[PDB]
Amino acid sequence: MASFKLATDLPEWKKLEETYKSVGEKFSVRDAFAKDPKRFEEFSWIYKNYDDSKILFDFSKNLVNKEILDQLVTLAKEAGVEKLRDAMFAGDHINTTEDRAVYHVALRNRALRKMPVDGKDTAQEVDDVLKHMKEFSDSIRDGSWTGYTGKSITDVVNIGIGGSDLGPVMVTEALKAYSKPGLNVHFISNIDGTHTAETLKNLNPETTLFLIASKTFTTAETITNATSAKNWFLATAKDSKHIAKHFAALSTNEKEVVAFGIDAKNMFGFESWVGGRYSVWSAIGLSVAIYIGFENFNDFLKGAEAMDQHFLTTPLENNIPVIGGLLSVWYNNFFGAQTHLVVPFDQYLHRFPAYLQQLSMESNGKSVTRANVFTNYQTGTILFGEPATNAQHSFFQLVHQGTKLIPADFILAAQSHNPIEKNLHQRMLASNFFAQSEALMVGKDEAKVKAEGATGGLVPHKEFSGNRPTTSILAQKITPATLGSLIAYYEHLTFTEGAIWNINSFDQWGVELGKVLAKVIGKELDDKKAVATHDASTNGLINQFKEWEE
Amino acid sequence: MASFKLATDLPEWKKLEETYKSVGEKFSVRDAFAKDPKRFEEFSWIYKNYDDSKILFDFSKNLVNKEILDQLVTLAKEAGVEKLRDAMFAGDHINTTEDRAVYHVALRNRALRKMPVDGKDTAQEVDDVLKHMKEFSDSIRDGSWTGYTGKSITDVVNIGIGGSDLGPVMVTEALKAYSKPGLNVHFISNIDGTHTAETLKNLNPETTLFLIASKTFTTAETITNATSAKNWFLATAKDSKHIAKHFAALSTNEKEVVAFGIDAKNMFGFESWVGGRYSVWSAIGLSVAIYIGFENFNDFLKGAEAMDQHFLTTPLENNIPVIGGLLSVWYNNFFGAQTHLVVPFDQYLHRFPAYLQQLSMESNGKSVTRANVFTNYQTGTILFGEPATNAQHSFFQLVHQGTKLIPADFILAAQSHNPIEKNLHQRMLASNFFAQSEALMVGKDEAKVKAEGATGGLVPHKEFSGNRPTTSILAQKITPATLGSLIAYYEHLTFTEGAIWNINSFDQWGVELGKVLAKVIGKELDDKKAVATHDASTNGLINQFKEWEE
Ligand SMILES: O=C(O)[C@@H](O)[C@H](O)[C@H](O)COP(=O)(O)O
Ligand SMILES: O=C(O)[C@@H](O)[C@H](O)[C@H](O)COP(=O)(O)O
Ligand SMILES: CN(C)Cc1ncccc1O
Ligand SMILES: CN(C)Cc1ncccc1O
Ligand SMILES: [Cl-]
Ligand SMILES: [Cl-]
């Protein structure tokens, strides 16, 4: 099914190795700007969203020029990025190891284009779930859906883990400006009983709604947590008939939902072709629709749809997510940089790096290609980040003066939702965004340090290399539509990387393994008898725990 | 001045390069356990805290054996780790570029040992500040300190950034079990006005106390934020005489505190020899003393002091923070692993990786040695993480099946503060801790994948290499004392790495530059005139921002 086996044996890969040696390794971004008066225009692109809002993607402080980008585009052609993308959008089963379609793009098909899986259009089935989400979220928000004592819901608790948790977390944080007073969202995800205890501590069963978010509806942590929540609820409500007003399910598995005691009328469904890390667009985003309202959730979907259309219809050389993915390959595979940093200059987006860390690393942390052979090259990068300006005071020291190349994406909105003090804070925030990427590029040489007053041995400690690359992403405003487009940009960047490496970006056998590993040891923790059934470390740790546990 | 110039000048560094090729590169941990029945005992150590509680540090699933560890210890001797450590504890000015002592260890000197800077003991000066912290925090907690309308304080807001923020955040989250209902803590740190707006939205000026946390008391972000808080307060209170009941300062700069309008009686001092990322033990920890009580905060200090005593007095071969630091150097410098993962199996510790990311990367992200020459070897690693079990469902995919070595530390308490359902959740959490480190070691070979039912091209996709290293840290319970010892473990690990590399772990010239960069561009943002004073990218981003800003 694959058209090639190994990225390293694409003809352009060895050409890029040669370009790395002659041009890339010692690339001077300062010299690039000096050579090319049109560099900013040539290496920046304006994305226009469906609502005519705009996002500037400026790649011009990267270690890249026309020659390098053209070679990377050739590599993408040789790798059949476009063929794989088209197959994704056709509903083909490109998740080859689970024999599944990969159809998050269908979730945000608000245009109702024909988008078939197994030869049947999905547009109406997706739309019908959205209709249900709108009805229900409207009823929560207008008080027509009351708790078992006729009170409006005040608190919504999502219970889920991984893909069934982190999108809801990140997007409700990101779009918190769009929420209403008195209607709050909460998250229980960890099996650690602290998460249950602390989240429920101050909540009222009469005014709390639970969403049990689980694709399979069999995940140990989620079902255990959901049982705990049901117990807490019934401790006050007493009668199980009242569960129908307080528990809903977001799932693909109706039989297990109903077995759990949730009415099928209170199930919001989705399909197997929605990966967890691509799921916030589905029924899994119900907490978002409740928190900010369905219209805002729908605008978020439409932002993703617009970026999908950009990705599908734009030649590679001007295709924004492809460009980002090509740069990632350049750094990962030619420079040997193992990490990718994402820094929102935006407090609402504080969980955006963690969300991307799941999307990226879970997709692309693979060692086997679509030809079912092991790679002889690096795949997925380690993605990390925190918001600025905080990050500037902390690990930015190492970004500026350490020994590791750390490609970084900085993101700013031109307009704040909270423009206090006639935009005093916002102008200060913006000034940091510009100045930090400028400093990473320009650096500060020995002569400048001397001129500034340092002498003798102090001088080298105050030098900065510069030529440290960044990508700057400037939005007008982080609206629902903008956020939709930004997530989809990273989805399709991730797609591009995986396509070049010839991996399946859409399975997760290490995550699936983790969901079956613990039960064997759990059974050994039912008593305090020493164990010797494992390696000596695992035995030592279990046995020490048995001595120290309650 | 330094006893050697470059780590590469030390004879054992070249010997380790040879050991890496002969034994390390292909190291089999499975074979190591099969060869050595005492391996768990030989590569695990029990730490005993001042309160007779215990922490097990199990390094036996690392890519290490007796030969390797003996060589790394020799390298520590050659690098003069012990000499530098002793100088640290002696109060010598080992922060050579700022000409400062490095004396966070003096902040937790509850035994009142003689600990002099510039030949003058610091014990009583440190202790006097702690007396003041105890008196003030007790008065907040018991209601004897009232707001300007005669009400007890309900909410305490710390305003500060970087080292003046993240310790307070992480430690109050970690020790939240020790808090009391009705006395909450909050943090404003980002310059982004969202942080101010969202934090203050539901607070009452009459019952809110602000702590303005700033070593210098000049940081742009903090003073801007503090001024916004003052203005919010005065909008309600009216008269500045009322500030004295609602604002305190945590600082080294009395003149600037008083200039801001805070009474010197409400200043809690510290000295220049406390680095921000080592400051939560000082007056900067006041929010912790208020939230959980001074006695708990003192027990936290005593845990650090006990780990200090361990680091100072233990031969290198059994010195727990040194062992951790030597393994980090092994992976960073000989395997070329760029990252270090920390995963607390503990929801309260969810900000622990972020705190350690600052400690580590801001200390050790340096390219110049104490002999004032550039390193052409790797220094600080990129540290990241998130809590388990969540992480198991996300980026653990790449940990298990990607192409990058990611040395990982897993941390579990045997006892939960929230042992709900007769410890059902806690046994489940623990089972995951043991099972994940076991699986990273043993992996899953081709034969086992076939036996489990896969055929043909599916098989390689479900294989796991194993021999992926972990360190397991098992505490009895994450009490204040335990957390103190755990942070000090990472401080001294960080110390060890930097001593081997011969860098100054205690300066931060990139963070310092950050604090003076934005001012030029901030003045350019005072109008909407196009700018041409920078490189074309910086100009283009500024100019697009001016078109899109309010
Ligand atoms: O990325 C993944 O597949 C996981 O993080 C899942 O979302 C997680 O295990 C929860 O699975 P489920 O939604 O089936 O409960
Ligand atoms: O690590 C550092 O030195 C910084 O993060 C500082 O803590 C931060 O810049 C705040 O400085 P100050 O405490 O002087 O306000
Ligand atoms: C005509 N549609 C836009 C109505 C509608 N609204 C929300 C969800 C689905 C749906 O069909
Ligand atoms: C003698 N000391 C233990 C009393 C004391 N308590 C708290 C802080 C300082 C201090 O001296
Ligand atoms: Cl629509
Ligand atoms: Cl004491």
- Domain harbouring B21, CATH code: 3.40.50.10490
Q: Amino acid identity, residue B200?
A: L
Do A185 and A211 touch, CB atoms closer than 8 A? Answer: no
DSSP B22: I
CA atoms in the 13 A half-sphere facing the CB of A486: 31
* Secondary structure class of B184 (helix, strand, coil): strand
Phi-psi region of A62 (alpha: psi -120 to 50; beta: other; left: phi over 0): beta
For B149, phi then psi, to 5°, come to: -110, 10
**The two three-digit tokens of residue A99, written as one number:** 């024999």
Contacts of A92 (CB under 8 A, 6+ apart): A101
DSSP B388: T
* Secondary structure class of A7 (helix, strand, coil): helix
Q: Which of B126, B128, B130 to mutate to test the pocket of ligand 4 (most atoms within 8 A of CB)?
A: B130
Separation of alpha carbons B301 and B282, rounded Å = 9
* Secondary structure class of A187 (helix, strand, coil): strand
- Which of B541, B543, B544, B549 would you mutate first to test chain A, the one with the most A CBs within 10 A? B541
B92 domain-assigned: no
Interhelix angle B294-313/B320-329, rounded to 10 degrees, is 70
Compute CA distances B319 → A7, A350, B309, B315, whole Å: 45, 37, 11, 6
Separation of alpha carbons A229 and A205, rounded Å = 10
Q: Which candidate, B411, B289, B45, B294, places its Cα nearest to that of A192?
A: B411
Which residue in the list A362, A386, A491, A497 is annotated as catalytic?
Answer: A362
Q: Amino acid identity, residue B297?
A: F
Q: Is B523 exposed, middle or buried (0-12, 13-18, 19+ CB in 10 A)?
A: exposed
**The two three-digit tokens of residue A26, written as one number:** 């010692």
Separation of alpha carbons A310 and B316, rounded Å = 59
Separation of alpha carbons A305 and A89, rounded Å = 12
Do A346 and B346 touch, CB atoms closer than 8 A? Answer: no
Q: Are residues B32 and B164 in the same domain?
A: no
Do A282 and A270 touch, CB atoms closer than 8 A? Answer: yes
Under an 8 A CB cutoff, do B541 and A166 touch?
no
User: How many residues make up chain A in this entry?
Assistant: 550
Residues with CB under 6 A from ligand 4: B 127, 130-131, 134
A423 domain-assigned: yes
Contacts of A325 (CB under 8 A, 6+ apart): A492, A493, A494, A495, A496, A497, A499, A500
Separation of alpha carbons A483 and A112, rounded Å = 21
Contacts of A408 (CB under 8 A, 6+ apart): A340, A341, A342, A343, A399, A440, A469, A470, A471
Strand A54-58 versus strand A44-48 pairing type:
antiparallel
Q: Which candidate, B66, B78, B65, B61, places its Cα nearest to that of B14?
A: B78
Separation of alpha carbons B173 and B179, rounded Å = 10
Separation of alpha carbons B488 and B491, rounded Å = 5
CA angle A182, B169, B264 (to 5 degrees): 105
B519 domain-assigned: yes
Residues with CB under 6 A from ligand 3: A 127, 130-131, 134
The DSSP H or E segment spanning B248 is strand B247-251
The number of the ligand 2 atom at minimal distance from the alpha carbon of B284 is: 13
Do A101 and A87 touch, CB atoms closer than 8 A? Answer: no
CA nearest ligand 4 atom 3, residue:
B110
Q: Are residues B513 and B465 in the same domain?
A: no
Q: Amino acid identity, residue B395?
A: F
Residues of chain B neighbouring A508 (CB-CB closer than 8 A): 397
CA angle B413, B414, B415 (to 5 degrees): 90
| Cis bond before residue B389 (omega within 30° of 0) | yes
Say how many C-beta atoms besides its own lie within 10 A of residue A249's C-beta. Answer: 28
End residue of a domain, out of B467, B482, B501: B501
| Interruption sites in chain B after residues (C→N beyond 2.5 Å) | none
Under an 8 A CB cutoff, do A425 and B191 touch?
yes
Helix ranges (H only) for B346-473 are 352-364, 396-401, 420-442, 446-451, 458-461
Cross-strand pairs, B444: B464
Compute CA distances A218 → A163, A257, A259, A433, A517, whole Å: 14, 9, 11, 44, 15
Separation of alpha carbons A187 and A211, rounded Å = 10
Q: Are residues B58 and B140 in the same domain?
A: no
Q: Is B264 exposed, middle or buried (0-12, 13-18, 19+ CB in 10 A)?
A: exposed
Do B383 and B356 touch, CB atoms closer than 8 A? Answer: yes
Q: Which candidate, A472, A493, A467, places its Cα nearest to that of A63?
A: A467
Q: Are residues A207 and A337 in the same domain?
A: no
Q: Which technique?
A: X-ray
Do B378 and B13 touch, CB atoms closer than 8 A? Answer: no
B489 domain-assigned: yes
A88 domain-assigned: no
Do A27 and A440 touch, CB atoms closer than 8 A? Answer: no
Mark whether A515 is an active-site residue: yes
* B33-37 CB contacts, 8 Å cutoff, 24+ apart: B33/A535, B33/A536, B33/A537, B33/B60, B36/B65, B37/A536
Do B433 and B391 touch, CB atoms closer than 8 A? Answer: no
DSSP B476: E
B111 domain-assigned: no
Do B387 and B346 touch, CB atoms closer than 8 A? Answer: yes
Under an 8 A CB cutoff, do A545 and B521 touch?
no
Contacts of B122 (CB under 8 A, 6+ apart): B91, B103, B106, B109, B115, B116, B271
End residue of a domain, out of B260, B295, B330: B295
Contacts of A526 (CB under 8 A, 6+ apart): B427
Q: Is the CB of B161 within 6 Å of ligand 2?
A: yes
List strands edge to edge, sheet with A382-384: A44-48, A54-58, A470-477, A408-415, A339-344, A382-384
Q: Which candidate, A105, A502, A59, A78, places its Cα nearest to that of A319?
A: A59
| Cis bond before residue B379 (omega within 30° of 0) | no
Q: Which candidate, A396, A377, A384, A385, places its Cα nearest to that of A336?
A: A377
**The two three-digit tokens of residue A396, written as one number:** 């930015």
Q: Amino acid identity, residue B182?
A: G
Q: Resolution in angstroms for this experimental structure?
A: 1.6
Q: Is B296 exposed, middle or buried (0-12, 13-18, 19+ CB in 10 A)?
A: middle
Mark whether A310 is an active-site residue: no
Detail the DSSP E strand segments found in B295-348.
Answer: 339-344
**The two three-digit tokens of residue B188, written as one number:** 């404003």
B401 domain-assigned: yes
Q: Are residues A264 and A342 in the same domain?
A: no
Separation of alpha carbons A339 and B361, rounded Å = 14
End residue of a domain, out of A265, A295, A325: A295
Q: Is B309 exposed, middle or buried (0-12, 13-18, 19+ CB in 10 A)?
A: middle
Q: Which candidate, B219, B179, B268, B203, places its Cα nearest to that of B187?
A: B203
Detail the DSSP E strand segments found in A59-117.
Answer: 116-117
* Greatest extent of chain B over all pairs of C-alpha atoms, in Å: 80
Helix ranges (H only) for A265-395 are 286-292, 294-313, 320-329, 352-364
Cross-strand pairs, A410: A343, A472
**The two three-digit tokens of residue B475, written as one number:** 């505490």
Residues of chain B neighbouring A392 (CB-CB closer than 8 A): 162, 511, 514
User: How many residues make up chain B in this entry?
Assistant: 550
Interhelix angle B509-524/A420-442, rounded to 10 degrees, is 120
Query: Which residues constitute the domain of residue B520?
Result: 509-548
Say how many C-beta atoms besides its own lie within 10 A of residue A271's C-beta. Answer: 19
For B366, phi then psi, to 5°, come to: -140, 150
CA angle B230, B235, B237 (to 5 degrees): 85
Phi-psi region of B506 (alpha: psi -120 to 50; beta: other; left: phi over 0): alpha
Separation of alpha carbons A349 and A366, rounded Å = 28
Q: Which candidate, A330, A321, A312, A316, places its Cα nearest to that of A7?
A: A330
The DSSP H or E segment spanning A211 is strand A208-213
Q: Are residues B322 and B398 in the same domain?
A: yes
Q: Are residues A151 and A235 in the same domain?
A: yes
Say how many C-beta atoms besides its own lie within 10 A of residue B412's C-beta. Answer: 24
- Which of A59, A201, A424, A434 would you mutate first to test chain B, the one with the most B CBs within 10 A? A434
Separation of alpha carbons B62 and A347, rounded Å = 38
Do B17 and B23 touch, CB atoms closer than 8 A? Answer: no
The DSSP H or E segment spanning A30 is helix A29-35
| Domain count within chain B | 3
Do B194 and A392 touch, CB atoms closer than 8 A? Answer: no
For A383, phi then psi, to 5°, come to: -105, 135
Q: Which of A130, A135, A286, A295 to mutate to test the pocket of ligand 3 (most atoms within 8 A of CB)?
A: A130
Ligand nearest to the CA of B218: 2
Q: Are residues B335 and B285 in the same domain?
A: no
DSSP B343: E
Burial profile B178-213: b = 16 or more Cβ within 10 angstroms, e = fewer: bbeeebbbbbbbbbbbbbbbbbbeebebbbbbbbbb
Do B469 and B62 touch, CB atoms closer than 8 A? Answer: yes
Q: Are residues A111 and A68 in the same domain?
A: no
Under an 8 A CB cutoff, do B368 and A420 touch?
no
Separation of alpha carbons B273 and B120, rounded Å = 14
| Interruption sites in chain A after residues (C→N beyond 2.5 Å) | none
Compute CA distances B305 → A408, B19, B167, B318, whole Å: 38, 36, 17, 18
Separation of alpha carbons B307 and B121, rounded Å = 21
Q: Are residues A27 and A65 in the same domain?
A: yes
Q: What single string gives the DSSP state of each residue in B32-83?
A: HHHH-TTHHHHTEEEEE-TTS-EEEEE-TTSS--HHHHHHHHHHHHHHTHHH
For B279, phi then psi, to 5°, come to: -105, -5
Under an 8 A CB cutoff, do B542 and A163 touch?
no
Cross-strand pairs, B5: none
Compute CA distances A434 → A123, B515, B522, whole Å: 42, 13, 10
Q: Amino acid identity, residue B284?
A: I
Contacts of B213 (CB under 8 A, 6+ apart): B158, B159, B160, B164, B165, B168, B222, B249, B250, B251, B284, B287
Q: Are residues A14 and A140 in the same domain?
A: no
B95 domain-assigned: no
Ligand nearest to the CA of B98: 2
Q: Are residues A220 and A262 in the same domain?
A: yes
